[PDB]
Amino acid sequence: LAIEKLPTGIEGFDDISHGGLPKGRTTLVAGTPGTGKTVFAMQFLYHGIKRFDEPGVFVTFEESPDDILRNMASFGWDLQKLVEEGKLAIVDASPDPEFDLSGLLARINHAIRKYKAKRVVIDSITAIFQQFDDASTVRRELFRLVARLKRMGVTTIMTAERTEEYGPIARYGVEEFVADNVVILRNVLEGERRRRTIEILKFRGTSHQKGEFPFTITPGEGISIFPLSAMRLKQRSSNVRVSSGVPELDEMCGGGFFRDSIILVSGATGTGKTLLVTKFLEGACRNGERALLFAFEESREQLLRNATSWGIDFEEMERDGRLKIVCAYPESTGLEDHLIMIKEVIEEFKPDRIAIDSLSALERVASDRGFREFVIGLTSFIKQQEITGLFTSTTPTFMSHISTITDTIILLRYVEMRGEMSRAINVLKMRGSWHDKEIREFTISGKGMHIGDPFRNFTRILS
Amino acid sequence: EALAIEKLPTGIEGFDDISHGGLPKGRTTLVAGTPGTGKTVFAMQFLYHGIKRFDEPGVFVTFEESPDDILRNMASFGWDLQKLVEEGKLAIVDASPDPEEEEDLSGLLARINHAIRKYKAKRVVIDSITAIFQQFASTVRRELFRLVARLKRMGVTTIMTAERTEEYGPIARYGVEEFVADNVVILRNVLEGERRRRTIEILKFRGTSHQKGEFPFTITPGEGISIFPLSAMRSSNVRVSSGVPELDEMCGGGFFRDSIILVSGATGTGKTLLVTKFLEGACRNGERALLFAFEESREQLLRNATSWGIDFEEMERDGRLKIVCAYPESTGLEDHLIMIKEVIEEFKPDRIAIDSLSALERVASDRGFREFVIGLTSFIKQQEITGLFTSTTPTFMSHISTITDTIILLRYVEMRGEMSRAINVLKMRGSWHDKEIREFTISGKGMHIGDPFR
Amino acid sequence: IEKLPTGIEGFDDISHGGLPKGRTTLVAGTPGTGKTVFAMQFLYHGIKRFDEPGVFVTFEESPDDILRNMASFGWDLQKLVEEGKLAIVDASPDPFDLSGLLARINHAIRKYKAKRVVIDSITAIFQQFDDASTVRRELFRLVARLKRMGVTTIMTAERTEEYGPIARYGVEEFVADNVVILRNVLEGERRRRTIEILKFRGTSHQKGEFPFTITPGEGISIFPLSARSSNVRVSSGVPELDEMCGGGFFRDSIILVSGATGTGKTLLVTKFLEGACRNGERALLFAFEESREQLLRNATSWGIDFEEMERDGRLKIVCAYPESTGLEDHLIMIKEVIEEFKPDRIAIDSLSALERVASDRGFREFVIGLTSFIKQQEITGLFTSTTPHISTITDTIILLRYVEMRGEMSRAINVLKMRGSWHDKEIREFTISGKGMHIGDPF
Amino acid sequence: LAIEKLPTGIEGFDDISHGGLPKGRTTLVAGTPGTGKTVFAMQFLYHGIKRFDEPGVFVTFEESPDDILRNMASFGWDLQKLVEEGKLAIVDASPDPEDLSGLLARINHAIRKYKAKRVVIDSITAIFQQFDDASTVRRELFRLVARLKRMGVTTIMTAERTEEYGPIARYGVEEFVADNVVILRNVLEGERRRRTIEILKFRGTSHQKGEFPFTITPGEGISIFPLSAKQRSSNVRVSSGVPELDEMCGGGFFRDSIILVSGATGTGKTLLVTKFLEGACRNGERALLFAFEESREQLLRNATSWGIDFEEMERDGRLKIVCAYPESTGLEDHLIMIKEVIEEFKPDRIAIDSLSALERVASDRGFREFVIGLTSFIKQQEITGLFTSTTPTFHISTITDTIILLRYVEMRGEMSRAINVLKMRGSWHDKEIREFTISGKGMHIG
Ligand SMILES: Nc1ncnc2c1ncn2[C@@H]1O[C@H](COP(=O)(O)OP(=O)(O)O)[C@@H](O)[C@H]1O
Ligand SMILES: Nc1ncnc2c1ncn2[C@@H]1O[C@H](COP(=O)(O)OP(=O)(O)O)[C@@H](O)[C@H]1O
Ligand SMILES: Nc1ncnc2c1ncn2[C@@H]1O[C@H](COP(=O)(O)OP(=O)(O)O)[C@@H](O)[C@H]1O
Ligand SMILES: Nc1ncnc2c1ncn2[C@@H]1O[C@H](COP(=O)(O)OP(=O)(O)O)[C@@H](O)[C@H]1O
Ligand SMILES: Nc1ncnc2c1ncn2[C@@H]1O[C@H](COP(=O)(O)OP(=O)(O)O)[C@@H](O)[C@H]1O
Ligand SMILES: Nc1ncnc2c1ncn2[C@@H]1O[C@H](COP(=O)(O)OP(=O)(O)O)[C@@H](O)[C@H]1O
Ligand SMILES: Nc1ncnc2c1ncn2[C@@H]1O[C@H](COP(=O)(O)OP(=O)(O)O)[C@@H](O)[C@H]1O
Ligand SMILES: [Mg+2]
Ligand SMILES: [Mg+2]
Ligand SMILES: [Mg+2]
Ligand SMILES: [Mg+2]
Ligand SMILES: [Mg+2]
Ligand SMILES: [Mg+2]
Ligand SMILES: [Mg+2]
Ligand SMILES: [Mg+2]
């Protein structure tokens, strides 16, 4: 058989939930203040109408209907229309400053029938315990509401507050009663930085993905969940070769970089990583293909000034409309946030080539787990969209395991030689091509890079 | 008495090994756990297996989920539900206030005693004893205390489920670990770095022996609860080929058909090439080959294989090759096994290949991985299949090593102005092998393993 | 939701505009965070920046004290009291008034026609009462009528622990719309002031903690460092090095001199600051290792004269200790002195000293924040770093090394990295004397 | 000895307790549910009535006398017969679904009736639950110990705990049943439980301080292992299974010796293990193999290849191969097992392949404890012990008597292997690094 589920509209949740929220049942959304219990509730009712024309009811035991509307309107949600259309109904159960319980419970049951709603929200189920001191009576009344909503065949979602993030499901023993489905939101503080996370603890009779998943409440978008579990090892590959910007490196790769590829350029500082990047993006704009560049080290001025000395004209291509130097700081937001910005501008720009510089900048202010998840998540999409990607990783050991993902590993190192700090290049991997296995000496000028001959008496330096 | 505490088996996979036979018969057992630990599933499976295998009718007393819901919830598992209920095989007694606007032994004792008598049951489940408290204290404890005695006299192997607040803390809510102090089974679902892991444990069995500690399990759909007792886990001179003939000579004839081979090295060394040759060997002779990729897409695998001179679509069309392809983060290792064991059972392969294990190491803890490789190597051995595992050495510039029969090792080597490669068969049980580190060249023909280094 | 610029440096950045206008915000924090000060800044800046009358109420302190406590900041608050820009309703218990005190508060708002308002310690009320009926009176008019009156309110509240509940007496339950958390985290034997906006129901904000500091002549100075490289070369101080660095250092460049002790890193800072003062340019030396005494003779022995640089007002030695405070506290003094000095060049000797007195992030945060300020100010910045990762943050890198040759430790210099220029890629011998550095031939 | 102690008969307690339980006073045996309070308490009575002819009385406030008889059966004591013989008396103080003052009188009479020298009150903590008088209960409990003291009986008074490393016992029974306190623990560490026993205090007498390991074996019960393990050594030599290595050692290994075979992967450590074992079975001796890496199938293939039939040896009862996973149990539970098999097969030689496999599933602390325990046990039992360790090339060193070092080494243009005896306490040893080869006839050193 199959437990039926109702798509939420919060794309990503439907993947994690394997369809949606069990229909005709109550789902408990628990979270500490600031998580996103209210927003999550409207999207459930918003898409409910703006897709399946399923009427919904919002019972607010806290914030005023007027404020609710104002708060939610910034997400581009015209709910005042749905109200006038008779799709949505906001029931004001918030007490006024200037039988109360049992009366409101029935005044709610009126709205569920009047609008004949299938997607109800009881916002702040905890706020009813912080209002009716007869909690014993409240609990008994809430148990009835759940059974009533069940008999009425409504897919309910009742929000609940928590005191601690990694502590109890919810307060006021609200874990029980509404205990068929339990979704937990969190906002954990770690390293003076916050991380919104969503978890589905239990689905009675249904299946779901198990664990926390990063989410974000984006303005003019809403709750955007991005499951790395959804990532499917089903990317496409081709034998079509692009250019690197350096014809010599293209010969060393046996024609050039494959279009459907991820290239790693490893090396110490001052080796010439942010050079092969410029040539990479330059090679695109030259052929008319659109390029990108997410800098996490140098400003546009510096990037352009560095590039102007090498013969690459950025401002031209930037204005011509074949380049988009994003440039930001790794410490500004978080990896989960950065990933969204990258993914956001990609679809907009529709780039032929992407280029991170560096990944090490990002790794610094993260975890070994967080960095992995980021790297694993970002590489996949690029390969899914068939966008050629170059990634820069510094070697703090001047003279992570991202190489497992990358198809091409280009190593740039320094080589001391008779009072002369020379430079060496080698292609370590090409995945699907013949590459030159030779450690060639190269030199940088205002002309670019000149990959020369091997060191012959090459002191075993590389690797 | 002179009655050694008999252990009635429950069928549920692993528990009967962990419980040294099964649940103590003629007694109650506490299946405690926080929300979503799989107590309801555990309880039903106990009953279900009862009525099917041992033909012992069972009664299910619910104090939360309505009978109709329970039937629908346990449906996807593929167990018969209404088929059994509509035959006096199973009985779901409801004690959850069906309505409200109402207000003991009236809604207990006899109701269950009747059910046991009516359906002639030998197994019973009391779902959520903790629910009684929320609904209806010292009186409730008395009734529940008498129920354990009544059920003992009636002679029924009972399971009494309860809830917990914390995973690593008090055994059960409302000190039910006193009313049903005798047999305790703990189910836990621990956070563990944003990655939930289910586990099962028998804290105590009064009068009998049991496997101590936490054992992992999974609540799969078409199956139910499956516990993996890595503890419980407990013959050929036929030499098979590798794909590379000179590597076979390095092994002294080839690989044994009943063996696990490890291939370790950094990226770009040529582990995937050896995999494509390993499988090609099977497809050539007319054997079957299964590949589990966790790193490269089905396309890229084929592309890079075609460049080496190895058509897989030919073999995949022949039905001698199958490629899985799945990111490790898709599910957990506990579920990954279940799937691997499924396609092996179905495809009935000769050679297997997991490329790579190192990709699966990132979606688990050390303990979780070690338990995984033990389970996979065991299954592969039990199914009489040659196996090749691959691992990336964090050596760009163990456990499997101890389990694997052959350890092949790939490495980069600088040759003065050139970056070369080298193969070495570090170990091979029950054969002479070439103990030298040797240069090899990758080409559009394959792997030309050549002269040794010094 | 509209926002009203607070006027607090850095908050309007993190708050993405300001505080939800016409809505109350909760400034929760433990004693000694800066709740009382933050509240005054709001009412203050507003009045001055845009005549928006405000009423401060105090259930704890008394106005005569409050005025004097905020006098150092340089806010003529008496004038506001007379002209009727600011008010101070003393609801502090006299060494009842459930409706009385609040009714008095409502009147003042109507009288002065206040747009801003502050309730200093909404917690105190609970302590300075009897029944928790205060909850009603707080979720009453206090908030509701404030919304009806259309005033942006700040309800200050106390907390017990830094990383615990949002408030003491479940004050959040009432003021549950917008919340701001101030903290004094301690950790180590130093203390860290950080500000976080946990919730702006309806609007967005920069998520997480952000460093802030109460300076005696400014107040809360939140630093949201989360928020034009020229081609004019300057002399390094040593001519051979200038040639090695392709004519000299870019004015918009971060130079990193790296090496052991005895290599000659402080020789190259002395030369660096010297070149500025020579050509009438300001130079500020941040000393973490050495002292005004050690430096003076160290320079004199090399043949530089800070004596006349002190007379000319060209050189400026701060000279402090890394363990005086955390890294957050350090940058302030330099950030301030820079404005007072207008430094063409500036140096930090050393950074390894500061790196020892904090965690990786603390250093990282300092590194990034330090580079920016001067980078966004047009001034050449040299950095000394002892070698027992600003290698990727720095533009130019100089590597000094001891080389053991023939049982006679020699000295060697090399420019490893320089963005935008050709650098000399030879490892040159150098000598030290009473004149300075003598960069010679390579090995 | 100041105060008199009564031997409990439990294996190990009498050692750690320096005699037994202080006689004429009550002892508290506290622990979380499933620690083994009841079993411990019964073995106390059982050995009393049997070995020492001291009658015992069991007072149960939880489990039914009938159940106790059934639960305590597999251990193999005829408790039912001895209840009839007038030695044992299980007082049913268990509550009925539908006054402690009188209940105490019932227990008091039983002691005087049977002339009990030993008494067990099971779960005092229960009493506080069953009867919610609190103060009234505490008083009667204080009167119980007072009365029991006068009649000169040695009492065990059990109590439940919540947390393992938390309070001594619930309901502060500590205050009443002070004087002597024993704590049983069952700690989950790495998804693996650890049974421990500790004498926190003995007022008046000495005892071994700290936790000690124990187990509950189905056919024996509580078996405590005083890790504090008084020996015998001689110039009696024994074979290694390889004649050249015997000559390298100086006429074979010493008998009572711990040998270590360290080396890289594929050197030949398991080979030496297989020969070491054969060296016993081929020279009329018994061998134990604790395999923590290879399965049976793998151990056989290696043996059959090198020309050794372990099956015959096992059929003739000369060899025992355990085969275990390091992750199955904890290392403390692993030793207990090893000791258990030794005290059954009574092996002349013992081999563990390998210690490095055990190190994976244990902390440095735990590994040391294991290595120390195993070494000390083999030497007190006077058995010849070999151990293998995987070393980088592809602390037992200090404790071991012999160190054989296998290594990869190039020579005449060939990557070959070599052996080197590094240590031999009480003998010359060839201090030369000799190359060797492996074949179907085992090792060949040359
Ligand atoms: N219009 C908006 N634009 C951006 N972020 C918003 C918007 N509205 C709310 N948020 C974010 O959502 C968070 C939680 O909002 P809400 O769901 O109302 O709170 P809670 O989950 O505590 O009930 C806020 O802290 C804020 O960061
Ligand atoms: N029919 C089903 N199909 C798949 N997974 C199921 C099914 N029923 C339950 N589960 C899984 O089992 C988990 C817990 O099951 P359940 O026994 O209801 O929990 P508990 O006993 O803790 O209340 C659910 O969160 C879900 O992941
Ligand atoms: N005009 C130039 N002439 C010669 N070399 C230059 C020139 N501009 C830059 N370089 C070289 O480029 C190096 C910096 O390369 P870049 O890719 O920016 O460094 P990174 O390896 O940190 O990414 C400098 O150290 C210098 O050797
Ligand atoms: N057609 C080809 N001709 C020559 N060399 C190739 C060809 N295809 C791949 N190679 C080389 O062989 C290597 C084998 O890569 P692969 O086996 O996928 O590495 P790994 O198993 O370590 O992930 C490639 O990285 C590349 O250097
Ligand atoms: N006039 C001042 N000059 C300098 N620092 C001040 C001044 N007033 C307050 N501070 C700083 O702020 C702290 C008190 O801040 P305040 O807002 O009064 O405390 P609270 O947040 O507990 O109400 C002092 O300990 C000091 O660090
Ligand atoms: N007859 C038996 N056979 C085997 N093991 C037993 C037997 N009786 C008890 N045990 C062991 O003792 C444990 C329970 O010990 P018990 O005496 O009940 O302790 P407590 O009273 O502190 O709960 C069981 O879980 C099991 O490990
Ligand atoms: N029949 C055989 N003939 C020759 N050499 C063999 C034979 N069987 C095994 N070997 C070699 O001996 C090795 C045995 O190593 P082993 O005893 O398992 O030690 P380790 O534990 O260090 O791997 C094998 O790896 C292989 O190189
Ligand atoms: Mg809400
Ligand atoms: Mg760079
Ligand atoms: Mg349940
Ligand atoms: Mg591979
Ligand atoms: Mg204050
Ligand atoms: Mg110095
Ligand atoms: Mg007991
Ligand atoms: Mg071995």
PDB file of C-alpha atoms in Angstrom, chain C residues 285-346:
ATOM      1  CA  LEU C 285      54.771  51.316  14.300  1.00  0.00           C
ATOM      2  CA  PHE C 286      52.682  48.758  16.206  1.00  0.00           C
ATOM      3  CA  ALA C 287      55.110  46.972  18.547  1.00  0.00           C
ATOM      4  CA  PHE C 288      54.000  43.732  20.236  1.00  0.00           C
ATOM      5  CA  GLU C 289      57.489  42.312  20.895  1.00  0.00           C
ATOM      6  CA  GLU C 290      59.822  45.215  21.658  1.00  0.00           C
ATOM      7  CA  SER C 291      59.610  48.498  23.587  1.00  0.00           C
ATOM      8  CA  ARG C 292      60.276  52.212  23.009  1.00  0.00           C
ATOM      9  CA  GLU C 293      63.637  51.646  24.739  1.00  0.00           C
ATOM     10  CA  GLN C 294      64.816  48.581  22.791  1.00  0.00           C
ATOM     11  CA  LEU C 295      63.634  50.114  19.498  1.00  0.00           C
ATOM     12  CA  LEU C 296      65.417  53.456  19.957  1.00  0.00           C
ATOM     13  CA  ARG C 297      68.925  51.993  20.312  1.00  0.00           C
ATOM     14  CA  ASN C 298      68.150  49.157  17.878  1.00  0.00           C
ATOM     15  CA  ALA C 299      67.485  51.891  15.300  1.00  0.00           C
ATOM     16  CA  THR C 300      70.421  54.043  16.456  1.00  0.00           C
ATOM     17  CA  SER C 301      72.733  51.042  16.011  1.00  0.00           C
ATOM     18  CA  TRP C 302      71.402  50.649  12.445  1.00  0.00           C
ATOM     19  CA  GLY C 303      71.718  54.408  11.824  1.00  0.00           C
ATOM     20  CA  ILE C 304      68.063  55.502  11.782  1.00  0.00           C
ATOM     21  CA  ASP C 305      66.897  58.459  13.887  1.00  0.00           C
ATOM     22  CA  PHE C 306      63.409  58.320  15.408  1.00  0.00           C
ATOM     23  CA  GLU C 307      64.550  61.230  17.614  1.00  0.00           C
ATOM     24  CA  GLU C 308      63.882  63.730  14.811  1.00  0.00           C
ATOM     25  CA  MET C 309      60.974  61.649  13.471  1.00  0.00           C
ATOM     26  CA  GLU C 310      59.407  62.234  16.900  1.00  0.00           C
ATOM     27  CA  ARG C 311      60.212  65.946  16.496  1.00  0.00           C
ATOM     28  CA  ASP C 312      58.798  66.089  12.951  1.00  0.00           C
ATOM     29  CA  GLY C 313      55.678  64.166  14.028  1.00  0.00           C
ATOM     30  CA  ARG C 314      56.414  61.578  11.328  1.00  0.00           C
ATOM     31  CA  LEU C 315      57.034  58.443  13.419  1.00  0.00           C
ATOM     32  CA  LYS C 316      54.650  57.135  16.092  1.00  0.00           C
ATOM     33  CA  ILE C 317      55.392  54.126  18.314  1.00  0.00           C
ATOM     34  CA  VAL C 318      52.344  52.768  20.155  1.00  0.00           C
ATOM     35  CA  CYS C 319      54.261  49.846  21.707  1.00  0.00           C
ATOM     36  CA  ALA C 320      51.846  47.616  23.641  1.00  0.00           C
ATOM     37  CA  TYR C 321      51.495  44.022  24.871  1.00  0.00           C
ATOM     38  CA  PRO C 322      49.505  41.257  23.054  1.00  0.00           C
ATOM     39  CA  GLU C 323      48.017  39.992  26.333  1.00  0.00           C
ATOM     40  CA  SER C 324      46.592  43.359  27.452  1.00  0.00           C
ATOM     41  CA  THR C 325      43.309  42.358  25.798  1.00  0.00           C
ATOM     42  CA  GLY C 326      41.948  40.079  23.067  1.00  0.00           C
ATOM     43  CA  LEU C 327      42.560  40.786  19.372  1.00  0.00           C
ATOM     44  CA  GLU C 328      39.173  42.514  19.043  1.00  0.00           C
ATOM     45  CA  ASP C 329      40.315  45.163  21.541  1.00  0.00           C
ATOM     46  CA  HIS C 330      43.642  45.850  19.788  1.00  0.00           C
ATOM     47  CA  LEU C 331      42.546  47.077  16.337  1.00  0.00           C
ATOM     48  CA  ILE C 332      40.447  49.850  17.952  1.00  0.00           C
ATOM     49  CA  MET C 333      43.425  51.868  19.238  1.00  0.00           C
ATOM     50  CA  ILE C 334      45.208  51.640  15.870  1.00  0.00           C
ATOM     51  CA  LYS C 335      41.951  52.280  13.983  1.00  0.00           C
ATOM     52  CA  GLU C 336      41.498  55.417  16.114  1.00  0.00           C
ATOM     53  CA  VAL C 337      45.123  56.612  16.068  1.00  0.00           C
ATOM     54  CA  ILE C 338      45.197  56.302  12.260  1.00  0.00           C
ATOM     55  CA  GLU C 339      42.454  58.944  11.968  1.00  0.00           C
ATOM     56  CA  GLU C 340      44.324  61.184  14.433  1.00  0.00           C
ATOM     57  CA  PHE C 341      47.661  60.667  12.644  1.00  0.00           C
ATOM     58  CA  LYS C 342      46.823  60.173   8.945  1.00  0.00           C
ATOM     59  CA  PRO C 343      49.566  57.523   8.368  1.00  0.00           C
ATOM     60  CA  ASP C 344      51.006  57.207   4.860  1.00  0.00           C
ATOM     61  CA  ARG C 345      52.817  54.049   5.987  1.00  0.00           C
ATOM     62  CA  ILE C 346      52.244  51.785   8.999  1.00  0.00           C
TER      63      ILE C 346
END
